[PDB]
Design a protein around this ligand. Sequence first.
Ligand SMILES: [Mn+2]
Ligand SMILES: [Mn+2]
Ligand code: NA
Length: 320
Amino acid sequence: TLNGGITDMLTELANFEKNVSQAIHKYNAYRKAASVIAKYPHKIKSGAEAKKLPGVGTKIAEKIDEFLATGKLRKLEKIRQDDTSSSINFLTRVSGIGPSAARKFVDEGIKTLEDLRKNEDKLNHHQRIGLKYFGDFEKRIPREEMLQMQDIVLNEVKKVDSEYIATVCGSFRRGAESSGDMDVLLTHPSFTSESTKQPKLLHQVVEQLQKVHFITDTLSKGETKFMGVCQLPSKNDEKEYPHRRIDIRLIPKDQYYCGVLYFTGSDIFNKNMRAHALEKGFTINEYTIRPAGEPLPVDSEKDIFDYIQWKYREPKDRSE
DNA sequence: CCGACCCGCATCAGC
DNA sequence: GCTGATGCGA
DNA sequence: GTCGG
Ligand SMILES: [Mn+2]
Ligand SMILES: [Mn+2]
Ligand code: NA
């Protein structure tokens, strides 16, 4: 329920705008109208009614009519049948395949996972992992596993250096009963915004997690960001836990809190809070919040909230 | 009528 | 080689 | 797509 009929239709319209139309802003517009209609409390019984809401303009209001009147969106119907667009859309679901490669692949007739597997040369490194773990990466990871996942990371990071500070942020920090990836925030004293008193700080952590057979594959690895694959150690004659995504960020200690607010999200919430900082006369990024002038001081997450006249929303409520 | 819409890493285009 | 643009995903 | 200059 919950105007679910509309919000699906919108969300579906959005995924076709990103993946097929490569119209990133129409995608955002649709998801937006969707997240708003989702908060509206009433059963929308009219396009005009929905048009009262912000984010709902005419076109979406037109579409709500066709939907409410026919239980169907003839555009969406056509799109779902369409071999080309159905494929470009599907392949996006492989990490490393955005809309741009999706369309290359379908142009050359590559349209399925089977077609991808027997085209391994035509896949860069990332897309080859994305295929190899296509299943696992769409599986949700239970909080019970998030915890097992947390222990290993905190345990191994301190084994490298007792001065590191590692914080699982993301859906996890928001109490969510299950999460998609493992987002992890990392800080060390040598790395500050002012200076980099030690190198390989991220590397060390990655190699250690890789030494203990926790991190199994790398998608992208820089000085300050890691994107990777990891796997709980299993038991004897027992099923192998699924392969899971993990993102590690090395934030300057001085900007720790601007990084927490950011890696905690949510993404809809983040753009919702960033878009309110601009109108309140501010710019908020994972490092700083600026007036764009000099770095405003920060020693709490709420500090950022008051700056834009926002009541502090406990991490559990930033699920927008 | 029209422009705006909230950064790190890999790969590629081009010099 | 190098820089800068683009894709992709946080 | 939607909104505001
Ligand atoms: Mn996450
Ligand atoms: Mn993530
Ligand atoms: Na993808």
